[PDB]
């Protein structure tokens, strides 16, 4: 359920397709089942936080489904970053 | 909604009454309306995370309603501490 946050964070600096997203979640955290990822990506498309498109069959990677962080998605991410700075301060004080 | 966590954290080392709880939430965080606190305390009593009792009219403070962290409450707190250590690591990596 934290997966939406991870995904918008990954997409901030580059449009990505599924493999790249999963790779970063593995490599940088301790989470991620592939099914879980595709469920999340569809949910975020639905909410217009991300926007999908396709690369060309004749491109280096062949046809992939890429995702773009939308303006709403960018807004969502900045809000999450703000909420995290706040929350992190409190919980460190009381659970640290 | 994070208030339940703050309250069990405060009660870990000492049984407290409302003023003391509110005081620590003020003094150590940036939160807390008194109504919000009494709503939370009743909810936690209901879930048997805390247990209330009363001091004597003739005591230094007169009659106060004190709260004790129960064994279930202690368990809840330890779980929250564990979840926080986990969450904090991930979110720092992706929202920091």
Numbering used by the authors:
A (entry chain A), B (entry chain A): 10 to 40, 42 to 106
Give excerpts from the publication.
We examined the structure and function of a gene product with the locus tag CDR20291_0991 (cdPadR1) as part of our broader goal aimed at elucidating transcription regulatory mechanisms involved in virulence and antibiotic resistance of the recently emergent hypervirulent C. difficile strain R20291. cdPadR1 is genomically positioned near genes that are involved in stress response and virulence. We have determined the 1.9 Å resolution crystal structure of cdPadR1, which revealed that it is in the PadR-s2 subfamily of PadR transcriptional regulators with other structurally and functionally characterized PadR-like regulators from B. cereus (bcPadR1 and bcPadR2) and L. lactis (LmrR). We also demonstrate cdPadR1 binding to its own gene promoter in a manner conducive to autoregulation. Additionally, we show that cdPadR1 binds the promoters of three additional regulatory signaling proteins and that a cdPadR1 binding motif is present upstream of 100 genes in C. difficile R20291.
One molecule of cdPadR1 was present in the asymmetric unit and consists of an N-terminal winged helix-turn-helix (wHTH) domain (residues 6–80) and a single α-helical C-terminal domain (residues 81–106). The dimeric state of cdPadR1 is retained in solution as determined by size exclusion chromatography. The recognition helices (α3/ α3’) are positioned ~34 Å apart in cdPadR1, which is consistent with symmetrical binding to two “half-sites” comprised of inverted repeats ~10 bp apart; it is important to note that this distance does not account for DNA secondary structure. Dimerization of cdPadR1 buries approximately 1100 Å2 solvent-accessible surface area (16 %) of the approximately 7000 Å2 total solvent-accessible area per subunit. Residues on helices α1, α2, and α4 that interact to form the cdPadR1 dimer interface are conserved across structural homologues. Helix α4 and α4′of cdPadR1 bend toward each other and interact via a coiled-coil, whereas α4 and α4′ of LmrR do not display a significant bending towards each other at the C-terminus (red). In addition, LmrR contains fewer residues involved in dimerization at the C-terminus of the helix than cdPadR1 and bcPadRs. cdPadR1, like bcPadRs and ctPadR, has a closed dimeric interface, unlike the hydrophobic pore wherein aromatic drug-interaction occurs in LmrR. The P-P, I-I, and I-P distances between cdPadR1 W94 and W94′ are 5.4 Å, 9.2 Å, and 7.4 Å, respectively. The P-P distance is ~2 Å greater for the apo-LmrR (P-P = 6.9 Å), LmrR-H33342 (P-P = 7.2 Å), and LmrR-daunomycin (P-P = 7.4 Å) structures when compared to the distance between phenol centroids in cdPadR1. The lack of a drug-binding pocket in cdPadR1 suggests that any differential expression of the CD630 homologue (CD630_1154) during Mtz exposure would, most likely, be due to a regulatory cascade effect rather than direct interaction of cdPadR1 with Mtz.
